[PDB]
Design a protein around this ligand. Structure first.
Ligand SMILES: [Mg+2]
Ligand SMILES: [Zn+2]
Ligand SMILES: [Zn+2]
Ligand SMILES: [Zn+2]
Lengths: 50, 248, 1343, 102, 72, 49, 72, 94
């Protein structure tokens, strides 16, 4: 039911239903996408040299 | 239109309802000049030089809308949908800084602190120390009092144990559980609790001899012994357990 | 009507006696007509007609045939409700064991037959043959014979050898067992078997045997042979929609039993081979087990649903069972609910009932009043009229509604102020309107709570509503008598805004004739609401014979305080409204109005406070804005300063000067100190504004900033949330308990960026999860405390004891955390309290110490008051009215019949839910005050150099002023370096003791020469050669690496004369040798001149939460129990390290059997020649509570718990009167163990109810014989609730099967006498207004 | 489920019970007959109490009531129809006509 | 109490309890010991300038932290 | 929802703990009027008689 | 009636007050009586407390009046 | 004696996991019916035989009733089914 730092970009830290199952039901973040394997992948723009 | 309690704001630290309220005062500030200009049928040199000014405010916003390349029947169409108020996009961790509200409030002729001086409706003398007004987006939630009000004098009962039914749709009663019984024994309400386990709940003889007694105008119960307990008595005696009632 | 409920075992003849026939077919109904069958499961010949006064056949369907039995189908013409109560029987073709009497864990059949459970479960499932009265053919009765052994032992023996298997065997064992013959032979061998396990098993079996003879049950009744079926209306077959049906699972279990019994009937009709009939009998026995309790044998069989079936045990036991879910928690007619709104036009005694709800709830009342006035003739005409809701039924309903309370109740009913009665005022709409003062008594806000409203029908319940449950009759919190109707947030902003001055307001310095002139000036707009004026004030004082002496003066007030003075009643002075009037000030003002004037003017005053507070808070215009968070200008500098500091410590960790753990600790400390600095800067920036002036100069004043005006008044929230608005947010937590070291340097008047907002959600999500998990377990502790304290009701007016706890405030070190006026108020003086001159009685005896008496004894500076306590009450099954004290929800003395066990359970549970649901742990004496030192256990020696070191053990420090009361209370170490002498009053600012935990000396009593005899280095000491100065050290050893030649022997610290003559102990003819325990730093030499009190041998070196009040009441034994001194007398050691040391305290006049198995890892406080009395300290740490009760009195575990439980409540800040922990403790230790059985009728090893012991010992001393002594036992509150007297009560909170089997085999009775008993049974409680009914029924039994 | 851990036995209603509005209607009809039968004399009220089952557990037949008074069931049928027509009138059926569901 | 105010009390108890439990482990004022209490190594003077009262040296405390990382 | 000309002040306890004081113009302009379409069925089943 | 404070001090016990006022209200409602104190359009259980308030109904006064009602 | 050390360890720590019972079962018994009968035998003490490492508050919230006579007769059982291997009560298996 806690929020782990790997929730950034993938599931909403804010939006969970409060009450009996808080943190058990999540909400998918805005740009969050699923992987080929089934994990939650979120876009990052590539930084080059600078 | 709606008066709100300010004491909910400092403790529950949602200051974003005060910042939206000030952005609601700015957004309905723009809209009451676009409305006032259409009220007088102002020429579009008044409109295209105010609304382009309104659409270009604050520090280095990514939105660049140029009304110079706008058709003239599109501008009055754009001014028709702004005569209520110009909508403001505050992106989530990106949007309106506090100075850009006050600058947008200064495009109206509204006071840049957010608070105007409000007069009492009934007695006409003002509230002192001026009051925040503005336009909060208030919702109407799916908890109406048309779906939560429920009452029952005497409705249908349950077959298995003879208690009143459950739920608002089944014309049901209120559950008087463990915690409402201890809080009744904590008074001295003996007679109030006897009727909430005999007359108002399950004792089938004692509950129709009450409804006749109330229509007779006699508030005296002849309660007896509940129907939750004779069902309990037959279920221990359906084991090989001779539990029986003694005599006085 | 029945007066008692008796439980037993069902006779087979009695099971056939209840029956109205036999169920033979497992058919239920007809499948075509849905009709009951001829002899099926839902029979009609057995259980009755399906329709009221109508046969199954159809012939005698008339209501003229009532009572006759039809000749075609055999049904009796009766009501169809008679098949709710009619049983039948099933005569089983083979006997079958009751699984309640076998697979219970005491296993009454197994414990009865003197055979273990494996024996009987082997024989019952057809493995072993069993000898029943086997003659004299080389056998033992009650022996296992396995099949081959039975066969080859039947050889050479033509006797019929009497070996059965199955329940025939156990039934013939249980029948042939003579209980009383076995009782006499068991007592005969008990005459000659005083062992431990042998005598224990003999008396353990003989207890069940003596119960079984005195009960009247037969042991062959445990083996069932005829089976009772339930009535069909308790396992119904209801026809649902569309042809579908719905049955109970007992139908399937009874069908299984009828199937297996019919098939076994055929298999014994058919002379089948024995193996398939063995399997059939075992199957039928298993079916009886699955029917009576589906799962005690294993496994619980599932039908066409994959949950297990509900069986008969599962229909009485369980959370959903009838004992829990249907005997108390049950729906209720004349009830309804809707949401709550405010509507503050109300008074304190009215709720706003909607009009459709009052039309629905009050329907029979409306019908009676509507046809009595005769506006309808028929009740059908009344029904059609009020369905039409004509213009007259509102007049009839508002007539009905006038003085008729409605019980408004909100769902988490933690205490008794969750139910209060209100007079209903008809409003439109559909929401209940509810007076804003009682929102803090229901904990009910207006984000959408719904209050359930009930109607009291009877005049007794209307008067119970009006006289107890009216919201004006309950304005004091029953936990602690402070008012619970405290004005909460808008009222305190109005009362704070009107009464807080401004330096230059309009209308300054005027002189007004009174408050009328002040309101006339303010309402006309000539004066501001807060302008310092000189008002003329008529304040009344009843400082005479209830007089209300008036006095008029000229006060220096503001205008708004004068306007607020009009709503004050007479008895209050003006100085109570001449201030800021925050939240605590209105609490104290309403408290003063109550204590002075009583109940009704407090209600009128609280209503006028609420009206004036809402009105002047409205006229405040107290907004909140974005410029009401002034960010401190130094915040950038403190943030940059802390970033420079953590850059510096980041450098010195990169330089390897400190590690990463200390670097994390240092940056957490640096950022927290910077957060305190930023909060201090903004709180000093906010609370002082600059205003100008009467003379035009700069003048600071308290700011009118609305966020400060909300935080400072106590309207809503405090300066921590103002820190998170204007100042920085701070360091944010983690669900791991850790702290995220990158803090949040921003706030909520600025924004948070994406990283800080993702950081905040760990702590906020953990907080909301713990909130929403705590509310699913809100009143578990309230439940656990009403179980232990159900049947405690005030029954006596004054029992007349002389005992009680002697109450003294919590002076812990410096200040007093809670004074005497908090505790001794309301309690009854157990003795006469004398003045500090010890000459005159202050309060006589049996007195209710109200606030006048407590004001008197606090003016007289009294310190040691012996109250009358609940744990020392001389009455039985109750408390007296004086050993409790006063009511605290009313201010009067308590009434006869208040359920103080339930009230105290709620007053520990409902303030207890304000505690944290998870637990949390957190040189020279600082002499500040001056006065006289008092010491108990004071035996000190002089030193040569003028210093002192105390050689008595428990000489702890007590400082007294010239007032009698204690000033500085501390524990003096054993031989710390005192600059304190004896008794002489010293001034503050001079150290009394220079302690050092490296210093625990064995400082001498007399001066002399410490020569050493019986002293050998190598087998007693270590070779300690201090190179540090070059001193002769002899540092003694433990039992680790020395020899056994000097292990039991001790080295002598013998201080002798200048010649070498052995100086005596002053007082004792023993020598002067102070033999040493382990690890003593010794500097001595043989023959050195040392003085008295010389430093010979120095020895080297608060939890909170609701789980603590869980564990304090369950009375846990801690894993480090501070062992005590079990008996008075001087001490010696014992055997060295057989795992544990021993220690023989030897009484100088008594025997010394106690060489206690002391572990060597818990080091001694004491020396092994140091006299300690009983109840004295040996180990250091959490003292076990049972050891306080065994050694010290019952007032020492009473004082221990109610100071340790209140150390959890006062730690968080929750106040509670300590009556409430004392009635729980009084019900905790109502067990005594017997030690001298005497002429009293109890065994030696017997634990029984103490108040049955104290009345038998009352009466067996009332003859010419002498009575027992007893050792009190104390238990946990889940274990004290186990040993109740009732079995109807005990089966509602304990496991029903273990309760009902223990109740049945004892042939037990329940004279009801209890709150939970009669609530289930449907009678009045023996507590409240039904106490006199239990007098009226206990009058007719002594007739 | 997931309501109060409620089971399907909690929502099955009994229709074969007696609702207390109909029962007090039935009880007040018992007394409203007793006042209309207070407006009849000795013979005609008594046959109307024993042609139906009013405070007696029959409902005698036409000859059985005429068996008590030795009448050949014809005057008994008329005196029933006379008293029945006697109760047909307004301000004789002003309480009972309201007792019929209309 | 709106169900997110008891959340506020729980979260402030969490932060304050953890931060006080850290700040009690800073050992602010002490004695200048000059020698470590498990090695007898000379603790450098800049380290005592940082922490007054370090009875352990830098890397013996690092070993203590690494041993305490798990427990026991 | 709707854009509501809001104010922040106590106003006589009618917005006391969490409550909202609402104008009659909000009700007059019908800004919070909502339609709610309930289905209500009647089934003719086959009983026995 | 708002509070029963005068009534509970005029009897001395809060629960026997409920019983005595219940008995008096039963006599006034169905027993057939007249209100001793004039009823100012009060319900029957408020007249009972205003009869207890003026000392006119206690347990022994009600009992001796029951004796007198049996006397005829 | 190993199941006696299971009883002693459960009452010494206030809980039992599945790992501790499965490490303190004997070597001779195989199938899952009898071992969860043993779980019922140890479970109606009740020493709270559940799946994982239990929480922190729910040993002080969960209670131990009733000491000790049910545990006395359960010790009488559990120190005596350490000898025979063929004991089950199922009519299908038997
Ligand atoms: Mg709420
Ligand atoms: Zn028939
Ligand atoms: Zn007493
Ligand atoms: Zn080191």
């Amino acid at each position: 039911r806690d929020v782990h730092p790997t929730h950034y970009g993938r599931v909403c830290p804010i939006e969970t239903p409060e009450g009996p199952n808080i943190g058990l039901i999540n909400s998918l973040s805005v740009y969050a996408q699923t992987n080929e394997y089934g994990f939650l992948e979120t876009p990052y723009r590539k930084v080059t040299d600078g | 239109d709606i008066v709100l309690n300010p004491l909910g704001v400092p403790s529950r630290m949602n200051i974003g309802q005060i910042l939206e309220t000030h952005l609601g005062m700015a957004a309905k500030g723009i809209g009451d000049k676009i409305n006032a200009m259409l009220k007088q049928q102002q020429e579009v040199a008044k409109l295209r030089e105010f609304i382009q000014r309104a659409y270009d405010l604050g520090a280095d916003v990514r939105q660049k809308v140029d009304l110079s390349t706008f058709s003239d029947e599109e501008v009055m169409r754009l001014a028709e949908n702004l005569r209520k108020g110009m909508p403001i996009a505050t992106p989530v961790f990106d949007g309106a800084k506090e100075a850009e509200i006050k600058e947008l409030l200064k495009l109206g002729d509204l006071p840049t602190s957010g608070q105007i001086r409000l007069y009492d409706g009934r007695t006409g003398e003002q509230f002192e120390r001026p009051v925040t007004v503005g336009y909060m987006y208030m919702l109407k939630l799916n908890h109406l009092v048309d779906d939560k009000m429920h009452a029952r004098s005497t409705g249908s009962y349950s077959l298995v144990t003879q208690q009143p039914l459950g739920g608002k749709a089944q014309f049901g009663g209120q559950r008087f559980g463990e915690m409402e019984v201890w809080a009744l024994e904590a008074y001295g309400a003996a007679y109030t609790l006897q009727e909430m386990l005999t007359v108002k709940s399950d004792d089938v003889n004692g509950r129709t001899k009450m409804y006749k007694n109330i229509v007779d105008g006699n508030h005296q119960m002849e309660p007896g012994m509940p129907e939750s307990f004779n069902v309990l008595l037959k279920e221990i005696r359906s084991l090989g357990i001779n539990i029986e009632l003694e005599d006085e | 009507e029945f007066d008692a409920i008796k439980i037993a075992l069902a006779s087979p003849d009695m099971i056939r006696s209840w029956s109205f026939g036999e169920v033979k077919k497992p058919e239920t109904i007809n499948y075509r007509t849905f009709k009951p069958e001829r002899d099926g499961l839902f029979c009609a010949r057995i259980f009755g007609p399906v329709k009221d006064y109508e046969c199954l056949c159809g012939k005698y369907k008339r209501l003229k045939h009532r009572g006759v039995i039809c000749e075609k189908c055999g049904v009796e013409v009766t009501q169809t409700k008679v098949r709710r109560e009619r049983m039948g029987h099933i005569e089983l073709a083979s006997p079958t064991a009751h699984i309640w009497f076998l697979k219970s864990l005491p296993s009454r059949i197994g414990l009865l037959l003197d055979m273990p459970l494996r024996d009987i479960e082997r024989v019952l499932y057809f493995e072993s043959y069993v000898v029943i009265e086997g003659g004299m053919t080389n056998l033992e009765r009650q022996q296992i014979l396995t099949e081959e052994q039975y066969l080859d032992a039947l050889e050479e023996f033509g006797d019929e050898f009497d070996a059965k298997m199955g329940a025939e065997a156990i039934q013939a064992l249980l029948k042939s067992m003579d209980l009383e013959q076995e009782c006499e032979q068991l007592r005969e061998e008990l005459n000659e078997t005083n062992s431990e396990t042998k005598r224990k098993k003999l008396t353990k079996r003989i207890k069940l045997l003596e119960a079984f003879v005195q009960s009247g049950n037969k042991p062959e009744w445990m083996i069932l042979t005829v089976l009772p079926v339930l009535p069909p209306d308790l396992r119904p077959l209801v026809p649902l929609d569309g042809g579908r049906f719905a049955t109970s699972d007992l139908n399937d279990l009874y069908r299984r039993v009828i199937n297996r019994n019919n098939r076994l009937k055929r298999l014994l009709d058919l002379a089948a081979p024995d193996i398939i009939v063995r399997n059939e009998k075992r199957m039928l026995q298993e079916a009886v087990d699955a029917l009576l309790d589906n799962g005690r044998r294993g496994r619980a069989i599932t039908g066409s649903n994959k949950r297990p079936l509900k069986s008969l045990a599962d229909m009485i036991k369980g959370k959903q069972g009838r004992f829990r879910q249907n005997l108390l928690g049950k729906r209720v007619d004349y009830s309804g609910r809707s949401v709550i709104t405010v509507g503050p036009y109300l008074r304190l005694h009215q709720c706003g009932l909607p009009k459709k709800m009052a039309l629905e709830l009050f329907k029979p009342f409306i019908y009676g009043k509507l046809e009595l006035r005769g506006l309808a003739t028929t009740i059908k005409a009344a029904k059609k009229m009020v369905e039409r809701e004509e213009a007259v039924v509102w007049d009839i309903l508002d007539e009905v509604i006038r003085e008729h309370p409605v019980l408004l109740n909100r769902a988490p009913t933690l205490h008794r102020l969750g139910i209060q009665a209100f007079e209903p005022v008809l409003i439109e709409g559909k929401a209940i309107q509810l007076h804003p003062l009682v929102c803090a008594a229901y904990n009910a806000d207006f984000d959408g709570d719904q209050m359930a409203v009930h109607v009291p029908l009877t005049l007794e319940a209307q008067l119970e509503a009006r006289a107890l449950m009216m919201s004006t009759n309950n304005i004091l919190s029953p936990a602690n008598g402070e008012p619970i109707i405290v004005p909460s947030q808008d009222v305190v902003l109005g009362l704070y805004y009107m009464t807080r001055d401004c330096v230059n307001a309009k209308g300054e310095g005027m002189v007004l004739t009174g408050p009328k002139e002040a309101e006339r000036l303010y309402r006309s707009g000539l004066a501001s609401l807060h302008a310092r004026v000189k008002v003329r004030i008529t304040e009344y004082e009843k400082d005479a014979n209830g007089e209300l002496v008036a006095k008029t003066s000229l006060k220096d007030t503001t205008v708004g305080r004068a306007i607020l003075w009009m709503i004050v009643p007479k008895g209050l002075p003006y100085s109570i409204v001449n201030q800021a009037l925050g939240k605590k000030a209105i609490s104290k003002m309403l408290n003063t109005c109550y204590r002075i004037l009583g109940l009704k003017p407090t209600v009128i005053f609280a209503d006028q406070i609420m009206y004036t507070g809402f009105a002047y808070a409205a006229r405040s215009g107290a907004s909140v804005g974005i410029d009401d968070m002034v960010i401190p200008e130094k915040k950038h500098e403190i943030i940059s300063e802390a970033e420079a500091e953590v850059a510096e410590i980041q450098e010195q960790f990169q330089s390897g000067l400190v590690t990463a753990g200390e670097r994390y600790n240092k940056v957490i400390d640096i950022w927290a100190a910077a957060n305190d600095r930023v909060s201090k800067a903004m709180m000093d920036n906010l609370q002082t504004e600059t205003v100008i002036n009467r003379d035009g100069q700069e003048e600071k004043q308290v700011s009118f900033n609305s966020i400060y005006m909300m935080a400072d008044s106590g309207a809503r929230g405090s300066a921590a949330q103002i820190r998170q608005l204007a100042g920085m947010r701070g360091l944010m937590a983690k669900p791991d308990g850790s702290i995220i070291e990158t803090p949040i340097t921003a706030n909520f008047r600025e924004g948070l960026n994406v990283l800080q907002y993702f950081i905040s959600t760990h702590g906020a999500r953990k907080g909301l999860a713990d909130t929403a998990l705590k509310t699913a377990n809100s009143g578990y502790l309230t439940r656990r405390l009403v179980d232990v304290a159900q049947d405690l009701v005030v029954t006596e007016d004054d029992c007349g004891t002389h005992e009680g706890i002697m109450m003294t405030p919590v002076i812990e070190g410096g200040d007093v955390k809670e004074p005497l006026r908090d505790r001794v108020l309301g309690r009854v003086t157990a003795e006469d309290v004398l003045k500090p001159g010890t000459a005159d009685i202050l309060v006589p005896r049996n007195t209710l110490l109200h606030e006048q008496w407590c004001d008197l004894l606090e003016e007289n500076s009294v310190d040691a008051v012996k109250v009358r306590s609940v744990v020392s009450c001389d009455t039985d099954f109750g408390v007296c009215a004086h050993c409790y004290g006063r009511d605290l929800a009313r201010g009067h003395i308590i009434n006869k019949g208040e359920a103080i066990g339930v009230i105290a359970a709620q007053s520990i549970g409902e303030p207890g839910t304000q505690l944290t649901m998870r637990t949390f742990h957190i040189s020279s004496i600082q002499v500040k005050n001056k006065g006289s030192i008092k010491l108990s256990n004071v035996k000190s020696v002089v030193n040569s150099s003028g210093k002192l070191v105390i050689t008595s053990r428990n000489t702890e420090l007590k400082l007294i002023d010239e007032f009698g009361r204690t000033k500085e209370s501390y524990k003096v170490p054993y031989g710390a370096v005192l600059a304190k002498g004896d008794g002489e009053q010293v001034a503050g600012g001079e150290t009394v003791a220079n302690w050092d935990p490296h210093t625990m000396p064995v400082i001498t009593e007399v001066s002399g020469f410490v020569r050493f005899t019986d002293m050998i280095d190598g087998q007693t000491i270590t070779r300690q050669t201090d190179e540090l100065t070059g001193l002769s050290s002899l540092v003694v050893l433990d039992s680790a690496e020395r020899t056994a030649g000097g292990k039991d022997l001790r080295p002598a610290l013998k201080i002798v004369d200048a010649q070498g003559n052995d100086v005596l102990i002053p007082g004792t003819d023993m020598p002067a040798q102070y033999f040493l325990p382990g690890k003593a730093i010794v500097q001595l030499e043989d023959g050195v001149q040392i003085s008295s009190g010389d430093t010979l041998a120095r020895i080297p070196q608060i939890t909170g939460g609701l789980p603590r009040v869980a564990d304090l009441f369950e009375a846990r034994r801690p894993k480090e129990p501070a062992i005590l001194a079990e008996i008075s007398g001087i001490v010696s050691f014992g055997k060295e390290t057989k795992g544990k040391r021993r220690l023989v305290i030897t009484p100088v006049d008594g025997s010394d059997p106690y060489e206690e198995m002391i572990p060597k890892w818990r080091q001694l406080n004491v020396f092994e020649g140091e006299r300690v009395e009983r109840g004295d300290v040996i180990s250091d740490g959490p003292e076990a509570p049972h050891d306080i009760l065994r050694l010290r009195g019952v007032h020492a575990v009473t004082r221990y718990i109610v100071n340790e439980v209140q150390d959890v409540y006062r730690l968080q800040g929750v106040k509670i009167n300590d009556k409430h922990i004392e009635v729980i403790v009084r019900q905790m230790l109502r067990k005594a163990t017997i030690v001298n059985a005497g002429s009293s009728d109890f065994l030696e090893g017997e634990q029984v109810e103490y108040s049955r012991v104290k009345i038998a010992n009352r009466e067996l001393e009332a003859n010419g014989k002498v009575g027992a002594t007893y050792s009190r036992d104390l238990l946990g509150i889940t274990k004290a609730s186990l040993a109740t007297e009732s079995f109807i009560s005990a089966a509602s909170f304990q496991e029903t099967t273990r309760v009902l089997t223990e109740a049945a085999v004892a042939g037990k009775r329940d004279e009801l006498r209890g709150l939970k008993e009669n609530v289930i049974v449907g009678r009045l409680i023996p507590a409240g207004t039904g106490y006199a009914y239990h007098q009226d029924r206990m009058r007719r039994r002594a007739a | 489920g997931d309501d109060e851990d409620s089971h399907l036995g909690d929502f099955i209603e009994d229709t074969t019970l007696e609702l207390p509005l109909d029962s007090a209607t039935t009880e007040s009809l018992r007394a409203a007959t007793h006042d209309v039968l207070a407006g009849l004399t000795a013979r005609e009220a008594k046959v109307l109490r024993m042609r139906f089952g009013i405070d007696m557990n029959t409902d005698y037949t036409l000859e059985e009531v005429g068996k008590q008074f030795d009448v050949t069931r014809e005057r008994i049928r008329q005196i029933e129809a006379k008293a029945l027509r006697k109760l047909r009138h307004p301000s004789r059926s002003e309480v009972l006509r309201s007792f019929l569901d209309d | 109490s709106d169900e997110a105010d008891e959340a506020y009390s729980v979260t402030e108890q969490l932060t304050m309890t953890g931060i006080n439990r850290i700040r009690q482990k800073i050992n602010a004022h002490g004695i200048p010991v000059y020698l470590c209490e498990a090695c007898g190594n000379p603790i450098p003077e800049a380290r005592r300038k940082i922490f007054p009262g370090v009875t352990l040296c830098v890397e013996c405390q690092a070993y203590q932290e690494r041993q305490r990382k798990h427990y026991a | 929802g709707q854009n509501m000309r809001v104010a922040f002040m106590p106003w006589n306890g009618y917005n006391f703990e969490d409550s909202i004081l609402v104008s009659e113009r909000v009700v007059q302009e019908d800004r919070f009027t909502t339609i709610h379409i309930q289905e209500l069925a009647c089934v003719s089943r086959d009983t026995k008689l | 009636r708002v509070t029963v404070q005068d009534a509970v001090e005029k009897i001395g016990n809060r629960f026997d007050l409920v019983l005595v006022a219940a008995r008096r209200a039963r006599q006034m409602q169905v027993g057939g009586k007249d209100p001793l104190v004039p009823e100012e359009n009060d319900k029957t259980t408020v007249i009972a407390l205003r009869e207890i308030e003026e000392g006119l109904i206690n347990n022994q006064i009600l009992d001796v009046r029951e004796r007198q009602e049996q006397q005829e | 004696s190993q199941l006696k050390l299971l009883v002693t360890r459960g009452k010494e720590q206030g809980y039992l996991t599945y790992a501790e019972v499965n490490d303190h079962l004997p070597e001779d018994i195989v199938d899952s019916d009898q071992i969860e009968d043993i779980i019922q035998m140890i479970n109606d003490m009740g020493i709270q035989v559940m799946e994982e490492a239990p929480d922190a508050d729910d040993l002080m919230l969960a209670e131990n009733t009733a000491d000790e006579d049910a545990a006395e007769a359960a010790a009488q059982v559990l120190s005596s089914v350490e000898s025979e291997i063929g004991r089950t009560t199922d009519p299908v298996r038997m």
